Write a protein that binds this ligand. Structure first.
Ligand SMILES: OC[C@H]1O[C@@H](O)[C@H](O)[C@@H](O)[C@@H]1O
Ligand SMILES: OC[C@H]1O[C@@H](O)[C@H](O)[C@@H](O)[C@@H]1O
Ligand SMILES: OC[C@H]1O[C@@H](O)[C@H](O)[C@@H](O)[C@@H]1O
Lengths: 307, 109, 110
């Protein structure tokens, strides 16, 4: 019969954009360790979780402008029994600031391009955010944007302002964001002003939700008697050939007749008629088989075949 | 081998989600970082425990089989690491390959 | 554990290129080398071979700093494996991970 006591010196500390570290220490007054104790952590706000852990520290990626709050408890499992202690608790308050002082409607967008130097094919990722100023913001207030990807945090260098000073957009032509990346992008927007505190605002984006896939390039259509050969190239991206879904759209400008084919290869053979001008476009997305569902590209520019 | 497999076992995973995610008391090891490949041993023991926990009626049985073949492939890749002894200059090249990579494309806490 | 900075990794690379000639100097040595390029699967063997170069070479000079660097990269890699299973989470969250894994396995190998 053992009697479990809660962990002690439970603290939360901010270690970077939308990132914290929970720590605690085993209870000095615990029935001596000859049994291995573990911990149960429960995140209470802003976004619920619990999970068990086996050491006395835990990282959590989370939004902070709403304040964060967490609890931890000690547990002991074995043959015939589970036991768990009362909880310790801790929280960070929401940052200081009036309600409408805060940035609103932040959208962020990623896109890939190719380094046309370096002798070796690697790629580059830009980032582009916009937001609006929020209704209570005082006239003199200035907003600043920071981003984080994995261990690298940068502050925005080149903004775009509304017609009286205030930053409303940001652009990074390069970043430390990996293309094929599978981690969260965290964005923070601070502010300041003569006449009071400004509420920060942060959020977490998943890359697949904001990566503006590039259209296919070099779509070619060769019309031969009655068959049309369409062809295109893999979009500019760091996902390999076998990772794309395409939609090919063939449109008869003579009568309206429309054909769209979804497929994973780079070529398509469609039967056609010989008295029409057709326009053909192609669209692209990366396969749910390589990453979670994201966005479709624009359609390539119309090319025309037939008379 | 096993190209065909994965793509199919993904949508299989997708359709059997609500069923799998129904034991809310169950806890499985999940890495805290994204170098997935360092963690296959854990990833596979979690599937094992999931599998012993979930009722073996339906097309779900197929999801597990599939995961077990993927398991086989990975086991084989792993045996290929220590299979073929070679001259030192060879091993050094590997090492420097391994170090470049560890450098350009792993996150680092 | 020590975050192995990318200058350190980078320094080690340089130190490696230097001592190449000293290191090969055992014609009798054979060392397991992986046929495929999924390093993350082979970290075990990588350090095992390092281990045998080490056990053979004389430590001193910048040659010691080499194995000291590798050693410190090895501990880091173990930090990272322990990190594979110190937290148990809801099925929902393990499913997400399994999914990522499969997708990266699909996009990186062949
Ligand atoms: O703790 C690291 C800090 O870096 C600063 O540049 C940012 O302004 C803070 O928001 C951040 O938390
Ligand atoms: O309001 C959140 C509460 O949830 C439970 O985990 C516990 O009863 C408290 O320690 C905690 O503060
Ligand atoms: O000027 C801000 C930036 O806006 C983006 O939409 C464009 O892609 C950049 O080329 C441009 O410099």
């Amino acid at each position: 019969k053992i009697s479990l006591l809660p962990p002690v010196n439970f603290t939360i500390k901010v270690t970077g954009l939308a990132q914290v570290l929970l720590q605690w220490k085993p209870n000095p007054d615990q029935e001596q360790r000859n049994v291995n104790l573990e911990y149960q952590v429960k995140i209470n706000a802003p976004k619920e979780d619990d999970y068990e852990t086996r050491i006395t520290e835990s990282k959590a990626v989370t939004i902070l402008h709403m304040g964060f709050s967490a609890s931890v408890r000690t547990i002991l499992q074995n043959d015939h029994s589970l036991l768990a202690s009362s909880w310790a608790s801790a929280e960070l308050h929401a940052p200081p600031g009036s309600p409408g002082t805060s940035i609103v409607n932040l959208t962020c967008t990623t896109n890939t391009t190719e380094d046309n130097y370096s002798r070796l094919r690697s790629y580059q990722v830009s980032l582009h955010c916009t937001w609006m100023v929020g209704t209570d913001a005082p006239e003199d207030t200035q907003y600043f944007l920071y981003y984080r990807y994995g261990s690298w945090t940068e502050e925005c260098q080149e903004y775009s302002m509304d017609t009286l000073g205030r930053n409303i957009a940001c652009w990074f032509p390069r970043t430390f964001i990996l293309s094929k990346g599978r981690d969260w992008l965290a964005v923070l927007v601070n502010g300041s002003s003569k006449h009071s505190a400004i509420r920060p605002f942060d959020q977490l984006f998943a890359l697949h939700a904001i990566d503006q896939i590039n259209p296919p390039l070099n779509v070619t259509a060769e019309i031969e008697g009655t068959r049309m050969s369409i062809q295109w190239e893999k979009p500019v991206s760091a996902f390999p050939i076998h990772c794309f879904d395409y939609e090919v759209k063939i449109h008869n400008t003579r009568n309206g007749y429309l054909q769209i084919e979804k497929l994973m290869t780079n070529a398509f053979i469609s039967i056609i008629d010989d008295l029409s001008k057709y326009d053909v476009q192609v669209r692209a997305a990366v396969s749910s088989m390589c990453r979670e569902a994201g966005l479709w590209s624009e359609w390539s520019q119309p090319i025309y075949v037939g008379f | 081998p096993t190209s065909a497999l994965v793509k199919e076992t993904l949508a299989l995973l997708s359709t059997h989600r609500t069923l799998l995610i129904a034991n809310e008391t169950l806890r499985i090891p999940v890495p805290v970082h994204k170098n997935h490949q360092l963690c296959t041993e854990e990833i596979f023991q979690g599937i094992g425990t999931l599998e012993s926990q979930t009722v073996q009626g339906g097309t779900v049985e197929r999801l597990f089989k599939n995961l077990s073949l993927i398991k086989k492939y990975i086991d084989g890749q792993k045996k290929k690491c220590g299979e073929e002894r070679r001259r030192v200059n060879q091993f050094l090249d590997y090492l420097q390959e391994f170090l470049g990579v560890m450098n350009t494309e792993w996150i680092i806490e």
